[PDB]
Amino acid sequence: SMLTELIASNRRSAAIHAFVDTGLSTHFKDGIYVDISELSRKSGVNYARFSRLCDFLVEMGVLVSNDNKFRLSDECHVFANPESFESFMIKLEICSHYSNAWLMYGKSLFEDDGKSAFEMAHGRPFFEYLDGNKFLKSNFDALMTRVSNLIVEKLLGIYDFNQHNRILDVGGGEGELLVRISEKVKGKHYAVLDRYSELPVSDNIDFINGNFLNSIPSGYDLYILKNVLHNWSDSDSILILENFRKAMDKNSSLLLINMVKEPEFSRSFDILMDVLFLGKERSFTEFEYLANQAGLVVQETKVIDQSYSPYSFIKLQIK
C-alpha cells in the first residue's frame, strides 16, 4: 500500500545503516561484484539473513543484482568509502540520540520554554551536549568537514578571494573550508573561530576559542559564516549578524553561505533543524531581512547548486 510503506519509511534508513555502520559496504569497493557466500565465509556475516538485506538494498537502488551477485549502484559508490559524506550522514541520521530526539518532537511542539526536542531527550542543547559525547562530536565535525571540502571548488570559482588579506571563518568547525582555500589562495592570514576545549593545531591557521553570541573579533577584511544561521532562532540570528556589524569597518566584507528554502526541494531538513536546534531553513529574502535588521546590506547574491541541497552565497557589508 502507499500509506503502509510511507509509515514504514524508517525501514529503508535502518537497512542502509545496518549495511554501512557494520562496514560490510566497504567490501563493495571500486564497483566490483561481491559473492555473498564468499563474503559470509570471509567476514563471518550470516549468508541467508544478509542475502535478504541485499535483496531489499537492490529494491531501494543501492545494490545492483547480476550473476547471483551484488555490486553498489553508481550513485551509491560513496557507501564503499566509510569517510564519504553519505557514510557519515547515515551513521549520524540513525543513532540512538537522533531517534530519541525525534521521539520528543511531538511533545516539543507543545512547550514554549525554548527547549529543543534533542534537549528534552538528552538534558542539554545540541552543541552543549556534544562537549560530553565523543561519538556524536567526531561524526558531526567529520560530516561538516566533508560537505565543506565538497563546496570549496564552487566558492573559489564564483568569488575573488585573492583581493582580501585577513580572513576569519566564524563557526568554521575543524576549519576544513579555510584549510582548502589556504591551499589555492596563498600568503594570507587564516583564522577559524569555534567552541574549542582544546585548540586544533594546523600549519599557518589561527584557531580561536570564541562565542559568536558574545562578539566577533575585529581586524579581518573577510568574514565567513557558513551553515550556522539555520541552527538558531530569528532573534539569535540578528544577534550574531549584529555582532558582525560591530566588528566590521566599511572596507570589511561578510560571506553568509547557507542552505536555502527552494520550494521544489524537500522540507525534511527544515524539520530536523527544528528537532536538533529549534532552527529552520530560510529563503534568500528571509536571510536579507535578518541582515537588514542587523544593519548589514547585500552587495552580491549567488545561488550555488550542491549534490544534497541548493546554497545561498550572500556578500554583506555594513550600511
Ligand X SMILES: C[S@@+](CC[C@H](N)C(=O)[O-])C[C@H]1O[C@@H](n2cnc3c(N)ncnc32)[C@H](O)[C@@H]1O
Ligand Y SMILES: N[C@@H](Cc1c[nH]c2ccccc12)C(=O)O
Give catalytic residues, as residue numbers. Answer: 230
Residue 148 in contact with ligand X, rule: CB under 6 A? yes
Strands 222-226 and 253-259: what pairing?
parallel
Looking at the Cβ atoms of 50 and 118, the one nearer to ligand Y is: 118
CB of 72 to ligand X, least distance (A): 27
Helices (H), the chain: 2-7, 10-21, 36-43, 47-60, 85-93, 96-108, 117-122, 126-130, 134-158, 176-184, 234-247, 268-277, 284-294
**Interface residue with ligand X, options 71, 164, 226, 282 (CB under 6 A):** 226
Choose the contact partner of 270 out of ligand X, a copy of itself, ligand Y, none; CB within 5 to 8 A by kind: a copy of itself
Choose the contact partner of 143 out of ligand Y, ligand X, a copy of itself, none; CB within 5 to 8 A by kind: ligand Y
Pattern of binders to a copy of itself over 45-84, x per CB under 8 A? xx--xx-xx-xx--xxxx------------xx-x------
Cα–Cα distance for residue pair 243/245, rounded to 1 Å = 6
Choose the contact partner of 81 out of a copy of itself, ligand Y, ligand X, none; CB within 5 to 8 A by kind: none
Residue 306 in contact with ligand X, rule: CB under 6 A? no
Q: Using alpha carbons, select from 188, 194, 226, 198 the residue that is nearest to residue 208.
A: 194
Pattern of binders to ligand X over 166-195, x per CB under 6 A? -----xxx---x----------------xx
Count of other CB atoms within 10 angstroms of residue 257:
22
The grid coordinates of residue 236 equal 539569535
- Report how far apart, in Å, the C-alpha atoms of 285 and of each of 198, 228, 231, 282, 312 are: 38, 17, 18, 8, 10
Looking at the Cβ atoms of 103 and 213, the one nearer to ligand X is: 213
